[PDB]
């Protein structure tokens, strides 16, 4: 590969979501054996664009998700004199 | 001498007097904002004793400072293509352009991805692309996403934005005619959809001519890419300046390790080996520091980008100069080699005229306010117009609305409502 | 590991915490590690050297213990103001911004404490089940070209409608909701049909 | 062994041959007097910024 | 000049005088067999991360 030299997994055509990242667009994953490939970017979907043609949706979803942010980190004071020193 | 700041320009403010626009322009703006820098990995054991046995029994003494270096670098490396991933990988399934290409007369030849071209880029990006320019245990990791993986990305986020408008960027792509997408965002800015209408062709040309212009612009003029350059610029002299200090003796007989081992004894050479050992290793602290200051700086700015890209590209911003200066219609993102360039599509209104204007209009002892437009008047006549765009109108009972006497209102004026 | 983020944070400061612990265990070129005994068996003079040693390599260990840990309280200072900011602009209002609060059109957004941070409960709206329809800029009658006020023109294949852009809600072509602006010949793409006029039957 | 600390009656059970036990992060915490030949748990006197 | 690499040929050319060669951070790139007069090359045996 261009990150360097792997040895235990075997080479594929097929492309997949990446799953460990071995880098330059390579990655590998555990599907009896270890597989390398180059990962898959995503669904080749061609919209149906025309100069007269809408898509209109005819219903919806109400999708809650979650987000994760850390706000705060624990508050630690080292006394430099008794740590250096005792 | 003294700086001047600016003109000196008196706004001919009144108390009656507005100025409508009655012409627009649009103009595509580039924005460069850096996402990633080069991921380095520094091996603490051989920069600072190369291949000696004795200096890295000595540096054993000192605990994890390498084991720690090589954790703060190996973050570094790995925060670096989450900011590629938060940057580009906004989108779901790798949209494509249809081969017959009628947006309006929009042309997007030079965004759009050239087959003929190596990396699948767009013409745009070679020019980004070009206008840019292992030893002592530092190696370069490749980036996860290559520069044509980047590239399909953003070839996919532009033909997601030119087909289905901001609709892919909430949920499944909905195809739209690029005329009546161009429409909505004009409505997005306050603009009727007539005036895109009436004017297609004028407003297809005025992008068209930005775009060359932003072409000849990045062809001409050197340094317009002056962050991207900045970024690469700082990384290798800190890399070189690593390099460099390992050629200082730090108050040792010599900089080389060997001679030191070869010429003296090893309880001497021990002391000579202790001060060559604490002055690499803080040459490399210092040089790691200021690797996770930059990569800090680097992860803000991805972070700007990819909201950028979120709120412009995948919609349209209301927010005064988030997405260009002028009110943003919309964006398309380019691949910078280690950033990303946004190109941003905005309505510049031009060609105003200055017009005698009303709060509202008194009609059979009752006040009469605009709905959506204006109060104006030529000088004998009153209509009615929208903010943005001069359209006068007939005073009407439709576009206007009633809300109590005529009295209480300051500076009211005399008019007739029509009544269709 | 669906908190990963909070858990990442944790990690590092405890990691960092017993890096600095481990390093006192290191000599950094003194007889000793312990300072005790270095007291116990050395005299002042010699033993002055060898704490001076411990004393330089525990104050660089203690410096570069809080340099790290600045650093990472700026990250946590950036991730604390965007976390204030999704408060104040997805819980306390609805926002407008794309994918700000989720990926979808933002509709509200409920906060809830984690043991370090916070988690937001984004709720969005998704369209889906989508169809495709015939669709004009606008419609020639009488000459006069109409516009939708907040619509889209749509077409089954024999009649036109007018619907609202984000939801199927076909409505007949009137002029309460359409506007009329010119001729139509400037217009690209437009088509003919009947803008019903409500006042009339009336009449 | 030398230091500063409370010793309480430990719990803990030693092996024959064992002598004193180090906790996480190498910290001596666990000592068996030679005479008597019982587990002592040593505890640092408490200690804080004021 | 003494040093541990790959002497790989190159096709530099050095001038009549010029013996060594170096690089923008001034190392060893080139050295000039001083028997037979070949340019040669220097490049750094393989390392890396495993
Ligand atoms: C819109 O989608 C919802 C699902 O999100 C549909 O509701 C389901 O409809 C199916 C019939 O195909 C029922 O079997 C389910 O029990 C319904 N689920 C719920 C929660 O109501 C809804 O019918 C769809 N509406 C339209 C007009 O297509
Ligand atoms: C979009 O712009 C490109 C480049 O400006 C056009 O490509 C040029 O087309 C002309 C013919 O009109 C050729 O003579 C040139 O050689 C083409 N390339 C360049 C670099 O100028 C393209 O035709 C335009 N699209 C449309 C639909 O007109
Ligand atoms: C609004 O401004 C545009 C400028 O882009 C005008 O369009 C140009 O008009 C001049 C005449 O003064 C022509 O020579 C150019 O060929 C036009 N350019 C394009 C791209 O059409 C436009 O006329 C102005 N509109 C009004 C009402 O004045
Ligand atoms: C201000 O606008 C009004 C309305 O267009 C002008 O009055 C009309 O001018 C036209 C000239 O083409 C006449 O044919 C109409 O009979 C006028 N009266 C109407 C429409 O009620 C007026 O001339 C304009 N004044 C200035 C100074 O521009
Ligand atoms: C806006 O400013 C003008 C100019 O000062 C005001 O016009 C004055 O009105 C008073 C009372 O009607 C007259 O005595 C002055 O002679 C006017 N001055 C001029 C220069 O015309 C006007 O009242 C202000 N307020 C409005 C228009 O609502
Ligand atoms: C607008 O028109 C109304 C109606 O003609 C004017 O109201 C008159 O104001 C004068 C002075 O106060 C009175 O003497 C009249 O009796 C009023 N007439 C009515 C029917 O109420 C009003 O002054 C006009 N305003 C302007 C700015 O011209
Ligand atoms: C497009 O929609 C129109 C409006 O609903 C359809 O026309 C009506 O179809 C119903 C079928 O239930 C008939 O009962 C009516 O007589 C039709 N005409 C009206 C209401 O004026 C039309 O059939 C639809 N076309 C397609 C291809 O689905
Ligand atoms: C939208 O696209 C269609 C299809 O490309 C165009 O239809 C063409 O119209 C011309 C003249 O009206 C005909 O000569 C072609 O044969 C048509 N093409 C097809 C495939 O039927 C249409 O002109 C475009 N513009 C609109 C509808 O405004
Ligand atoms: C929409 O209706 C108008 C008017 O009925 C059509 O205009 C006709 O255009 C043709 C060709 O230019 C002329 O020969 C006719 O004389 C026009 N009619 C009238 C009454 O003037 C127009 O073509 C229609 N649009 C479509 C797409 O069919
Ligand atoms: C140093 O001595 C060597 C040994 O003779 C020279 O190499 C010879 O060069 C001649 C010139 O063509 C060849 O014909 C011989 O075959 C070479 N010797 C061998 C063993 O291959 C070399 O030229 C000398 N260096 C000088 C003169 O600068
Ligand atoms: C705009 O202002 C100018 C200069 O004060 C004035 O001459 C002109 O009449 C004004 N135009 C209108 C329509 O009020
Ligand atoms: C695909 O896999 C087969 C099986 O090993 C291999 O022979 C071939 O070279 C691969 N690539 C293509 C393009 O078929
Ligand atoms: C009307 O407004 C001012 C008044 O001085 C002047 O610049 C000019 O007459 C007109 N300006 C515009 C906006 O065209
Ligand atoms: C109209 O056209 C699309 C084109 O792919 C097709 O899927 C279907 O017939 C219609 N739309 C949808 C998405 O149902
Ligand atoms: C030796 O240890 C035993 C048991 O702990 C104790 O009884 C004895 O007194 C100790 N020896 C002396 C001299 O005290
Ligand atoms: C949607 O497009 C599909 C595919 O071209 C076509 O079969 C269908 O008739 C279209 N439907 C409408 C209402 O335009």
Not at chain 1, 42 to 50: F, I
Not at chain 2, 20 to 33: A, D, G, Q
Not at chain 2, 124 to 136: A, G, P, Q, S, W
Not at chain 3, 141 to 158: L, M, Q, Y
Request: aromatic content about 8%; overall charge negative; some cysteine.
């Amino acid at each position: 590969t261009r990150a360097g030299c792997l040895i235990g997994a075997e080479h594929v055509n097929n492309s997949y979501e990446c799953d460990i990242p071995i880098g330059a667009g390579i990655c590998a994953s555990y599907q009896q054996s270890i597989i390398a490939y180059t990962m898959s970017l995503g669904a080749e979907n061609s919209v149906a664009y025309s100069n007269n043609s809408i898509a209109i949706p005819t219903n919806f979803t109400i999708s809650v998700t979650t987000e994760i942010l850390p706000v705060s980190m624990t508050k630690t004071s080292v006394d430099c004199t008794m740590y250096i020193c005792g | 001498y003294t700086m001047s700041l600016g003109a000196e320009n008196s706004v001919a403010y009144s108390n009656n007097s507005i100025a409508i626009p009655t012409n627009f322009t649009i103009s595509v703006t580039t924005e460069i904002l850096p996402v990633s820098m080069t991921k380095t990995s520094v091996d603490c054991t051989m920069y600072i004793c190369g291949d000696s046995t004795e200096c890295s029994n000595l540096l054993l003494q000192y605990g994890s400072f390498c084991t720690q270096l090589n954790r703060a670098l190996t973050g570094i490396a790995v925060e670096q293509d989450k900011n590629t991933q938060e940057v580009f990988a906004q989108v779901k399934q790798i949209y494509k352009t249809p081969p017959i290409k009628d947006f309006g007369g929009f042309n997007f030849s030079q965004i759009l991805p050239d087959p003929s071209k190596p990396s699948k880029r767009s013409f745009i990006e070679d020019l980004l692309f070009n206008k840019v320019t292992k030893f002592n245990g530092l190696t370069v990791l490749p980036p996860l996403l290559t520069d044509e993986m980047i590239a399909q990305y953003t070839s996919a986020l532009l033909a997601g934005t030119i087909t289905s408008g901001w609709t892919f960027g909430a949920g499944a792509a909905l195809q739209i005619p690029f005329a009546m997408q161009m429409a909505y965002r004009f409505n997005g800015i306050g603009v009727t959809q007539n005036v895109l209408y009436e004017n297609q062709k004028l407003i297809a040309n005025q992008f068209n001519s930005a775009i060359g212009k932003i072409q000849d612009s990045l062809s001409s003029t050197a340094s317009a890419l002056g962050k991207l350059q900045d970024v690469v610029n700082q990384n290798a002299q800190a890399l070189n300046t690593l390099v460099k200090q390992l050629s200082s003796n730090f108050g040792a007989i010599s900089s080389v390790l060997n001679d030191i081992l070869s010429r003296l004894d090893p309880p001497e050479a021990e002391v000579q080996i202790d001060r060559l050992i604490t002055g690499r290793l803080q040459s490399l602290q210092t040089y790691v520091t200021q690797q996770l200051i930059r990569a800090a700086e680097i992860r803000a700015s991805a972070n700007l980008a990819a909201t950028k890209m979120s709120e412009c590209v995948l919609g349209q911003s209301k927010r005064v100069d988030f997405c260009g200066k002028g009110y943003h219609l919309m964006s398309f993102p380019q691949s910078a080699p280690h950033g990303v360039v946004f190109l941003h599509v905005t309505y510049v209104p031009a060609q105003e005229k200055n017009f005698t204007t009303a709060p509202a209009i008194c009609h059979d002892g009752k006040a009469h306010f605009p709905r959506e437009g204006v109060f104006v008047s030529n000088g004998t006549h009153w209509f009615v117009t929208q903010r943005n765009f001069y359209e006068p109108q007939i005073i009407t009972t439709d576009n206007t609305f009633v809300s109590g006497n005529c009295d209480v209102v300051i500076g009211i004026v005399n008019n007739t409502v029509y009544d269709p | 590991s669906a908190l990963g983020k909070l858990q990442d944070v944790v990690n590092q400061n405890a990691q960092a915490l017993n890096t600095l612990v481990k390093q006192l265990s290191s000599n950094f070129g003194a007889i000793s590690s312990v300072l005790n005994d270095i007291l116990s068996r050395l005299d002042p003079p010699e033993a002055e050297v060898q704490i001076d040693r411990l004393i330089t390599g525990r104050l660089q260990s203690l410096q570069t213990y809080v340099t790290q840990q600045l650093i990472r309280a700026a990250e946590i200072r950036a991730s604390a103001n965007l976390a204030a900011t999704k408060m104040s602009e997805c819980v306390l209002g609805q926002s407008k911004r794309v994918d700000f609060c989720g990926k979808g059109y933002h509709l509200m957004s409920f906060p809830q404490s984690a043991p370090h941070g916070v988690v937001f409960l984004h709720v969005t709206y998704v369209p889906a089940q989508e169809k495709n329809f015939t669709t004009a800029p606008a419609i020639c009658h009488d000459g006069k070209a109409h516009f939708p006020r907040e619509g889209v023109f749509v077409s089954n294949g024999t009649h036109w409608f007018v619907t609202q852009r984000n939801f199927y809600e076909p409505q007949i072509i009137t002029t309460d909701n359409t506007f009329v602006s010119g001729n139509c010949d400037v217009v690209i793409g437009i088509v003919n049909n009947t803008v019903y006029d409500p006042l009339q039957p009336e009449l | 062994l030398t230091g500063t600390g409370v010793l309480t009656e430990s719990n803990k059970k030693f092996l024959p041959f064992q002598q004193f036990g180090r906790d996480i992060a190498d910290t001596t915490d666990a000592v068996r007097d030679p005479q008597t030949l019982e587990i002592l748990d040593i505890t640092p006197c408490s200690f804080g910024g004021v």
